[PDB]
Amino acid sequence: SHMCDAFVGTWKLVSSENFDDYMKEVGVGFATRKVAGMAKPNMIISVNGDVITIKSESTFKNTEISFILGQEFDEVTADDRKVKSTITLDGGVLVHVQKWDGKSTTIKRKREDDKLVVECVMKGVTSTRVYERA
Ligand SMILES: Cc1cccc(Nc2cccc(Cl)c2-c2ccccc2)c1C(=O)O
């Protein structure tokens, strides 16, 4: 058993708070914010050995990252940022830091009851995205 076991599986978005403001702070333009804000992504998390794969699938975009905990990697985000990413475990929370253009945002995935709760922080702006098993 590993701490990431609690995240493995297929998840669907069930609620979103303050996501438009978060995307604004990140620098997402108007049209992409409107279309991305409508999306109800599925999140698919799998593990093979040390490699964790996270997929986000929606009408807006299909994205996929594969990584090893603590090893920085290149990521092109759904809103087309080219970022440097590192994902680590903090207790049982997956902590994802993205850095680009001297900016930084942090995305934390945690298990709360039967939900997977995502907290996205950019400067002073915090958004919460709640996923349930699909
Ligand atoms: C759980 C999580 C972690 C990291 C990023 C996420 N979404 C986004 C963050 C910034 C900018 C954009 Cl456009 C998106 C986005 C919106 C709609 C569909 C796909 C991606 C999410 C999430 O969608 O909940």
Tell the burial category of 63 from Cβ atoms under 10 Å away from its Cβ (0-12, 13-18, 19+).
middle
Number of domains in the chain: 1
Give the residues across from 107 on adjacent strands: 96, 120
In angstroms, the CA 22 to CA 14 distance is 18
Best residue among 15, 28, 56, 110 to mutate for probing ligand 1's pocket (most ligand atoms within 8 Å of CB) is: 56
The CATH number linked to 3 is 2.40.128.20
Give the residues across from 63 on adjacent strands: 56
- Structure-block tokens of residue 44: 């698919």
Distance 19 CA to ligand 1 centre (A): 9
Q: In Å, how far from its chain's centre is CA 18?
A: 15
| Method used experimentally | X-ray
- Structure-block tokens of residue 80: 């087309």
The parent domain of residue 67 ranges over 1-134
Tell the burial category of 124 from Cβ atoms under 10 Å away from its Cβ (0-12, 13-18, 19+).
exposed
Resolution (angstroms) equals 1.6
- Structure-block tokens of residue 89: 């475990």
- Structure-block tokens of residue 49: 């050995």
